[PDB]
Design a protein around this nucleic acid. Structure first.
Lengths: 122, 122
RNA sequence: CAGCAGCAGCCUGCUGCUG
RNA sequence: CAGCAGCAGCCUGCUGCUG
């Protein structure tokens, strides 16, 4: 399957996660999780994120309106399907959802959501 | 029950809705729906919204971090409960969710979400 | 707009288990 | 971090019905 994502997954092993836990706290995780769902099919990423401007830039590059539309168009036809973006960081989940006919507006709200969550003050 | 909302519901009757439908389109609804959930209990509003600055100001006043905390604190105790804000406008739904311990950050993201959705270009 | 039903997903909270 | 299970809600899409 063609993913909407432009960067590889970065999930930590169980050992790396434990080590990070011993060293640090829910407000300073290794990163964030995000996902894109098109009908039944869901694509997921855990991406490292350290709250710098460099890191923000890098992770905002993990998908675009174009990469999402290319991935999503595989699943399209005459009938509308449900499409959903989710992101979770520091205890808060944001989900942006609606039909395929609205996908451009779902991307616009998804990217704005992602940016505001990742920049939310301590 | 004490609501998190500071303005009354504005749901249209079935007849008003039909009349509006005959006169206008999903991109020009009478307004938007939003809701706040605390554990099992959900509070809901349909609010008129006409995409002016005056109207934006008015509807952004429908809840505050304080009104949400007063309402939500009724349901609190030692264990965390789930808390959720949702808003739907013009085919797109945004939901912001997490545990009561995070409620201040849920409000901050909820209000930012609401503002961006209600201002999204045609 | 609202309520009801069938189907299909998704997210949140709680509890327990595994790695 | 990941997978599994019990419970409780929520949102999206499709289909049908009512007002």
């Amino acid at each position: 399957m063609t993913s909407p994502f432009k960067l590889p997954d970065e999930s930590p092993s169980w050992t790396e996660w434990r080590l990070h836990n011993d060293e640090t706290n829910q407000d300073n995780p290794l990163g964030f999780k995000e996902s894109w769902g098109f009908g039944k099919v869901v694509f997921k990423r855990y991406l490292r994120y350290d709250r710098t401007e460099a890191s923000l830039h890098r992770v905002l590059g993990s998908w675009t309106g174009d990469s999402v539309n290319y991935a999503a168009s595989r699943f399209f036809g005459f009938d509308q399907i449900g499409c959903t973006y989710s992101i979770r960081f520091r205890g808060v989940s944001i989900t942006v959802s609606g039909g395929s006919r609205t996908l451009q507006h779902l991307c616009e709200m998804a990217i704005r959501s992602k940016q505001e969550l990742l920049q939310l003050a301590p």
